[PDB]
Structure 1
Amino acid sequence: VQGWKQRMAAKELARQNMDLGFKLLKKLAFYNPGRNIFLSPLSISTAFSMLCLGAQDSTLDEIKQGFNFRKMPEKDLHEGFHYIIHELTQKTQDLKLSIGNTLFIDQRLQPQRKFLEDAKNFYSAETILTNFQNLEMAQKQINDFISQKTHGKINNLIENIDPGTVMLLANYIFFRARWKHEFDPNVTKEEDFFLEKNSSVKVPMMFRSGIYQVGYDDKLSCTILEIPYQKNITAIFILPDEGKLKHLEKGLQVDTFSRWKTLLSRRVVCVSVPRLHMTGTFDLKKTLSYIGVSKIFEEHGDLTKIAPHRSLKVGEAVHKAELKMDERGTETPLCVKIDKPYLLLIYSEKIPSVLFLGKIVNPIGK
């Protein structure tokens, strides 16, 4: 198979998006406790790798350092990300997934052919001409473009545009997938979800008994539960013990994940999982401060490969992750009840990549 090198590159990139995700989640939760955090570290990485096609010198170097894209040649980096995107991008009965990367550039600028072709060929990234002299009109244009492209999955991506912006990066991902075994919707019931040790809220809770990969981590005081999707993707639920969420967050690592896998076994489990409709919106300028990346957002003369204008920078960059978790699917000595704050990892096994990383403090909250 001629796709061997692309798969190896992707496998290495996947390990690095896991590290990125845990670093981002740790920082986001430290600065914003008691809040849901829902993002795609993979989608975020595709955006800045795509920008590496048009970035030079210090800006290029700092992205590659911050995102850890330095371990392989640039050709392999782009080929690896192309493989991940192409493999995951589907509109089938079992999986609906798209990674969107749209660069909105001021109509007065001239986006260069080579960058345009590479962005489209390697990432399916598109550059759209925008009139930034009318910020209100530019915002409604951007939001309508993305709502239409995503078929109403990614809405209101932009809430504000700063004056002087000539280049806006929009990164967005949506997910719909069928479970390997569907939940019976008639068995789904409104159950208690403990926001705090005393405070509760009624949430639609899905129920099913069957064979599931399950384990317990003594080192991080947490239960691990894997629920497979029909395609080679798994939903990993990490349920900390009472008052161990902060400890679990603090201990998250790449070695953590590979150790959790050594603690799992196939067992008959009665499972209780909340239904979800998660969205997460991030200002990537503030988010990327956590991994020391900022030159891409400053004027440095490093983006001439995109458009020749001297003062060019990425003015604004936004990430939006969207997911639905319900009963849809194909066709006890242990019980795992997800009725308190938990971590959710959507993991692609075939790559293997972290598609989504979520801290769910409230399944029906923002």
Structure 2
Amino acid sequence: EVQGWKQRMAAKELARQNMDLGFKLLKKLAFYNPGRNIFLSPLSISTAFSMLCLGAQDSTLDEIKQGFNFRKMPEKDLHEGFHYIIHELTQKTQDLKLSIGNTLFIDQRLQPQRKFLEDAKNFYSAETILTNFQNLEMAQKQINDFISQKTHGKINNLIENIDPGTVMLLANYIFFRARWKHEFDPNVTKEEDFFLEKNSSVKVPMMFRSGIYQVGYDDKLSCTILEIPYQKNITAIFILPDEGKLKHLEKGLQVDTFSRWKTLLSRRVVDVSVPRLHMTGTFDLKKTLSYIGVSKIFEEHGDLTKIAPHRSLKVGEAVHKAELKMDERGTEGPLVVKIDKPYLLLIYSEKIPSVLFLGKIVNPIGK
């Protein structure tokens, strides 16, 4: 209880760092891809490359730690911190279904080392699965089926392409199902307009509830903040930019922003309209990580011999997939906040405190 203090402290500092990462990834992703939905888990992304530090050495290890900012604390604390984060969040209960998966798919000719395997399992619950990469079509079919089975059909078609010569593929995935502190009534959910532009709109299933919620307005970022709590100590933070202020919001988000919003939010009676969601986000981590200058893990440098003793070993391919369902489900028993235009969604763990998911929702029924 008391013992686990250092694990929580390390986790509190790492969660501060995944918040920054998340805002950096969204800002980059939205700059290159405007007008599109972005849905990732900066926390799950981080566990994948922190797990790899258990098997990386020299220039590769150093670049991962610099890019991800794992440099402030000792390596022992980094791994014990992430072990704590994963152990606390991983659940299969009536209230919360949450899992962070990390699977290394390595060529069946190679021999993953006992020590790396025990460490990855013990600290991250990460597993290595031997694959026949000489048959690329069958390998993709085997990987996708392994994950679909593992996640009970929550994480499907993770891999779309395998480059020839790939001997090591990293698969990082997260799914989420949670009950709200107070359920929405399905009988009150109606098809409503979601404005894709000021001029254009589509009909979306819109949920409605009236009750007490932590609500506020940020005049610096020009946005409305609404928080809807889950039954377990997790919160859905809805950030609704003002008409013409979406870019300003994306460029303005930082770590200090949260402690600033704490003084802007108060518990008030709000008439809430929130779209239902079934979001997925798939990312090629070789491209994504170029935003934080991490590339050596994807190149041959003789730095991964702790994973498998072959000098030419690199991570050939790395994919992230985030999945979330947002509906009326919750625990059974005014201002106006209408989430009917493009918005940001932060799934925030309060007990860690970590950013589990970060989404840019331009269309709740599209991409």
TM-score by length of 1: 0.99
Q: CA deviation at 1:256?
A: 1.4
Q: CA RMSD in A?
A: 1.1
Q: 1 CA distance for matches of 2:319 and 2:337?
A: 36
In structure 2, what is the Cα distance between the partners aligned to 1:304 and 1:322? 33
- CA-to-aligned-CA distance 1:287-341 (integer Å, 9 cap, x gap): 0000000000000000000000010000000000000000000019311000000
Extract unaligned runs of 5+ from structure 2.
Answer: none
In the aligned structure 2, how far is the partner of 1:271 from the partner of 1:165?
A: 49
In structure 2, what is the equivalent of residue 258 of structure 1?
259
Deviation of the 1:359 alpha carbon:
0.2
Q: Deviations over 1:133-161 (max 9, x none)?
A: 00000000000000000000000000000
- Retained in 1: the 8 A contact 2:182–2:333? no
Q: Distance in 1 between the 2:121 and 2:222 partners? A: 45
Instruction: Please list every run of at least 4 consecutive aligned residues from structure 1 whose deviation after the TM superposition is greater than 3 angstroms.
Output: none
Distance 2:283 2:108 in 1: 26
Provide the rounded CA distance (Å) in 1 between the counterparts of 2:42 and 2:312: 29
**Aligned counterparts of 1:246 and 1:82: Cα–Cα separation in 2:** 35
The CA distance in 2 between the partners of 1:247 and 1:13, in whole Å, is: 26
- Kept after mapping to 2: 8 A contact 1:119/1:125: yes
* Counterpart residue number, 2:302: 301
Q: d(CA) in 2 for partners of 1:2 and 1:56? A: 31
1:191: how far off?
Answer: 0.3
Paired with 1:330 and 1:262, the residues of 2 have a C-alpha distance of 28
CA shift digits 1:212-247 (9 cap, x unpaired): 000000001100000000000000000000011011
Distance 1:175 1:5 in 2: 27
Aligned 8 A contact 1:270 1:332 in 2: no
For residue 181 of structure 1, what is the aligned residue in structure 2? 182
Count of residue pairs brought into register by the alignment: 366
* 1:81-123 deviations in Å (ceiling 9; x for gaps): 0000000000000000000000000000010000000000000
Deviation at 1:258, TM superposition (A): 1.7
Partners of 1:349 and 1:332 in 2: CA distance: 23
**In 1, are the aligned partners of 2:298 and 2:317 still within 8 Å (CA)?**
yes
1:48-89 deviations in Å (ceiling 9; x for gaps):
000000000000000000000000000000000000000000
SS of the aligned residue for 1:52 comes to: helix
* Contact 1:269-1:332 at 8 Å conserved across structures: no
Q: What CA deviation, in whole Å up to 9, does each residue of 1:240-296 have, x standing for no partner?
A: 000110111110100112211210000000000000000000000000000000000
- Provide the C-alpha distance between the structure 2 equivalents of 1:151 and 1:17, rounded to a whole number of angstroms: 27
- Determine helix, strand or coil for the equivalent of 1:82: helix
User: Is the CA contact (8 Å cut-off) linking 2:107 and 2:133 kept in structure 1?
Assistant: yes
- Aligned residues of 1:222 and 1:239 also touching (Cα < 8 A): yes
1:268 and 1:332 in contact (8 A); partners too: no
Distance of 2:207 and 2:246 partners within structure 1: 23
For the residues of structure 2 that align with 1:261 and 1:275, how far apart are their CA atoms? 26
* Whole-angstrom CA distance in 2 between matches of 1:7 and 1:312: 34
Asked if structure 2 preserves the Cα contact closer than 8 Å seen for 1:191 and 1:203, the reply is: yes
Structure 1: gaps (5+ residues) = none
Determine helix, strand or coil for the equivalent of 1:243. coil
State how far apart, in whole Å, the 2-side matches of 1:306 and 1:170 are. Answer: 16
Aligned positions of 1:109-148 closer than 5 A: 109-148=110-149
Equivalent residue runs for 1:191-340 within 5 Å: 191-331=192-332, 333-340=334-341
- Supply the distance in 2 between the matched residues of 1:39 and 1:172 (Cα, whole angstroms): 10
Provide the secondary structure at the position in 2 that maps to 1:9: helix
Does the CA contact (< 8 Å) of 2:41 and 2:355 recur in 1?
yes
Which whole-Å CA distance do the structure 2 matches of 1:333 and 1:351 have between them?
32
Q: Distance in 2 between matches of 1:133 and 1:271?
A: 54
SS at match of 2:251: helix
For residues 357 and 75 of structure 2, what CA distance do their matches in structure 1 show?
A: 25
- Percent identity, please: 99
**Cα distance in 1, alignment partners of residues 252 and 237 from structure 2:** 17
